[model samples]
Target: MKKYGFNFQWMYVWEEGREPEPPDKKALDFLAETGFNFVRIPVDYRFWTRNFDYFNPDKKVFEYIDLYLRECSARNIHMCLNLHRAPGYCINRNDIERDNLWLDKRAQDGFVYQWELFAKRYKGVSSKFLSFDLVNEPPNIGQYGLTRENHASLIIRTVEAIRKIDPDREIVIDGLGGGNIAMPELAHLGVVHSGRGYQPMALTHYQASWWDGHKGLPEPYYPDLLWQGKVWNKDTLREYYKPWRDLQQKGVNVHIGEFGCFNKTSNDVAIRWFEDVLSLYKEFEWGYSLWNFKGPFGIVEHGRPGAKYEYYRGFKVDRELLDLLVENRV
Candidate 1:
């Protein structure tokens, strides 16, 4: 099957005193009812660690995840476990990390150790229902002194470590530069290359409070947008994804790990933009997962302005967007 679905963040973060919530059965049930079969779980390392202690993980997190894994398996949903916040690197909030994953040896060791532990814990699990997305969007090549060569080495080493414990476990890695630049060096590693759909940030992240770059940007429209000295349209998107297509042509597997419009954008415009994005995904024959299953980037309760909502299964579902997504599912 050509996997496509949502990135569920129930275990995404553990804010200082508060624990991250567990997976919601309603969300899973909704996906099953809608005929979607994949859920990418992005997790934070701090959930299983104590006070920034990277090496010694509390075993409770494993048991917590065991239930989630079982739930996905029972429902026939493919769950791709992703480390959004790893031992020493996260795309956002890098200052909070204890060490630089790209430069520090201890950080690299801890990162691989986490994967090794998982590889052993789920050694017998079939790849049909579970896979490992090695990390979230990695930093640009220059951040934290990371270069293409070192990044490739780290991924290669980690892949070797995981295979040593569970040879059949599938692995995925996001593209560098926030999942935009495809890495040709790692194309032969036998791992899936994950991409993003937030191109033309002016449209996807307009007025996103968390994004500093989006501040002060003019509201965007679909089919024709002028930002960063370029006129962005469907053709522009094609140009932006050429590298990924080239990489895929080399026989490397590819997937869109995250993609969606923030709630700040008009729902109508967002839908228009999504039509083009989904069209490209179909053209490229790549599976995709929306950034989330609920909240701003979700099909239900997205809170986008001017969206026609319908009460479906006791939730305000974005029926238009949901239909668009369902029609595009491979």
Candidate 2:
């Protein structure tokens, strides 16, 4: 299978309350036809929450997941199941501060129990067609009552728990934000550790309102326009991601789990950023999945009426950007 991959977060199969869920068969087929061989599905555990229990994902949710899995399998596409927001543990707002999975024993036990159930459910599935991403962006040490060392230990423990059930299955581990931090401590845990390789976040997340730095600024227009100082270019990206590349060379298979500029940026700037990042990936033979297929950062937009969906449309598919993605496939 090709190393280039695509990712879809908060899409039809992963959303919590969108009635008449979107048809994934067409979407999966569309992605495959676009030259992507792998799809990473980021699922919010809240969508499947049964009174705070991550293991108790809704039966209907599982049904939809299975359907999507079957579709991908039929299309000969690999899929990565990612718990975007695990119960009792999320880097985002929904989770209570200081109550992280790495610190709370109950959360740890719950996640392990859930993994056991997941392993049993997919016992005979082919590893090539399907793999697991242990968790979505884990919180930085200070954000979730976990020190950096503690967080690393938690990952090691989680790896042990999963391997007990399915030793041969591959697993993915997200790096600290921006993929800059070195986690040498995790290597001794006896598990495969994966890292995310991304361009300087200032460029990738240029003008994104969510970041603390961009608030109150007029909507961002271009990469060069977003930051006044040294702008992010190919050299900046290569330098910024050198540590992650080093880790990859040491047998840690890196995946740029999330990387993309907001659609608000001019098409030319977006394309340039894409080319620069893609070139670096090619040089290093790294694998990656763009941030999303359809959402605020999606390549396709659902032009529903209202402000609620306006930002959602921001990342809508732009032909020029899609062409760049196609041309840069690894």
Winning model by lDDT: 1
lDDT of 1 at 121: 94
lDDT of 2 at 274: 74
lDDT tens readout by residue for model 2, 63-181? 65676578788888887887766756654563442335867887787777766666767767887888887777765647656677777777777777777888876777776642445
Among residues 3 or more apart in sequence or in different chains, the pairs in candidate 1 whose N, CA or C atoms overlap within 3 Å are none
| Alpha-carbon deviation at 109 in model 1, angstroms | 0.5
lDDT for predicted candidate 2 compared with the true structure: 0.63
Best by TM-score: 1
CA lDDT, every prediction? 0.89, 0.63
TM-score for each of the candidates? 0.98, 0.83
Q: What's the CA error at residue 21 for candidate 1, in Å?
A: 1.9
